Amino acid sequence: STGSATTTPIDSLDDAYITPVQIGTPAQTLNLDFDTGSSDLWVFSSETTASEVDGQTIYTPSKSTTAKLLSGATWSISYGDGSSSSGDVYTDTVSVGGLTVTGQAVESAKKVSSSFTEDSTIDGLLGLAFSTLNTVSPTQQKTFFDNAKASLDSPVFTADLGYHAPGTYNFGFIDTTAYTGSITYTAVSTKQGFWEWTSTGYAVGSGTFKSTSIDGIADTGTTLLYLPATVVSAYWAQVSGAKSSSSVGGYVFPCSATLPSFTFGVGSARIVIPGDYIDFGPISTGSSSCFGGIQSSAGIGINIFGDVALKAAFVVFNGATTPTLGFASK
Questions:
Q1: Which residues act catalytically here?
Q2: What is the distance between the alpha carbons of residues 236 and 319, in angstroms, rounded to a whole number?
């Protein structure tokens, strides 16, 4: 089997991407944030504290003839950005782009933190990291991908995120029309439960490529590109007036600037992030200070190849017995 679903930016900045997901019988369609940096599929629901729901579409398990309470199971997750959610668990039928999994754990939120409430466009998350990170207790649950894998034509999914435009998540096949040139594959460590890999270096604009190993995670659920302070300083030094602002929470730059591109290495291959992808717009409405899309990972504890980086590529998440990651230009 295969599946193919369009993923759409939630706003004009590509702050996140939503993908429609069918849950239950008859189908309830919720727009979920596919997140290769976590491993829980959770949804706003009829059980979510009413004051914490503001415009989201909810899953109502009592209206699904295939829903079953997973007795005694609870979940609770905290994300790198400080947001969180928790609740109980149902199993139900879940379909993405025509690919159906029966008996998928659907984690129903009883509580969500303010950032979730305030984002009316995101009805929940669909985790695509390794199932070892799943938070369900006392019996850990599998991700949608893990459940689907054996049925897929090939044990892979691909992320093809758009810049200010829709893109695609495919399951079970590689669309050879969706990228240019060849796909370069690189090793993955699953030791921390992430799609963790080592970039071979970087360049700023038309500058020379610096060969240096940068360990980090391919994370579709993180908006920005978080890299070591040395790398980030080298980038922003090429933008007149750019500076790190403790008050704002990162590098800002004059909105009048033209940003240079940023290249990262995948083996001997190179992925180029155009400068415009690095612009996250005014820090507040009407400001002439703009927020940068490349930020320091110092004090995160891990480098994160988030959407800023991933949307410059066609990315293969290869879930074979020994997982690997593939990147192609597009």
A1: 35, 199
A2: 36
The answer to whether domain 5-174 and domain 175-330 are alike in fold is yes
Q: How was this structure determined?
A: X-ray
Q: What architecture is domain 175-330?
A: Beta Barrel (2.40)
As a dihedral over the C-alpha atoms of residue 288, residue 292, residue 293, residue 298, rounded to 10 degrees, the angle is: -160
Q: Which of 35, 88, 119, 219 is catalytic?
A: 35
**Which two three-digit tokens encode residue 98?**
């025509």
C-alpha to C-alpha distance for 183 and 11, rounded to whole angstroms: 29
Domain residue ranges of the chain, discontinuous segments joined by +: 5-174, 175-330
Residue showing tokens 């008859």: 26
Longest dimension (CA), the chain: 60
199 among known catalytic residues:
yes
Task: Tell me the CATH class for 5-174.
Answer: mainly beta
Q: What is the 3-state secondary structure of the chain?
A: CCEEEEEEECCCCCCCEEEEEEECCCCEEEEEEEECCCCCEEECECCCCHHHCCCCCCECHHHCCCCEEEEEEEEEEECCCCCEEEEEEEEEEEEECCEEEEEEEEEEEEEECHHHHHCCCCCEEEECCCHHHCCCECCCCCCHHHHHHHHCCCCEEEEECCCCCCEEEEECCCCCCCCCCCCEEEECECCCCCCEEEEEEEEECCCCCEEEEEEEEECCCCCCEEECHHHHHHHHCCCCCCEEECCCCEEEEECCCCCCCEEEEECCEEEEECHHHHEEEECCCCCCEEEECEEECCCCCCEEECHHHHCCCEEEEECCCCCEEEEECC
Q: Active-site residue among 39, 95, 199, 296?
A: 199
What are the beta bridge partners of residue 114? Answer: none
The answer to whether the Cα torsion of 307, 309, 315, 319 is positive or negative is negative
Give the whole-angstrom CA distance, residue 85 versus residue 78.
7
Check if the beta carbon of residue 8 is closer than 8 Å to that of residue 166: yes
**Tokens standing for residue 165:** 């435009």
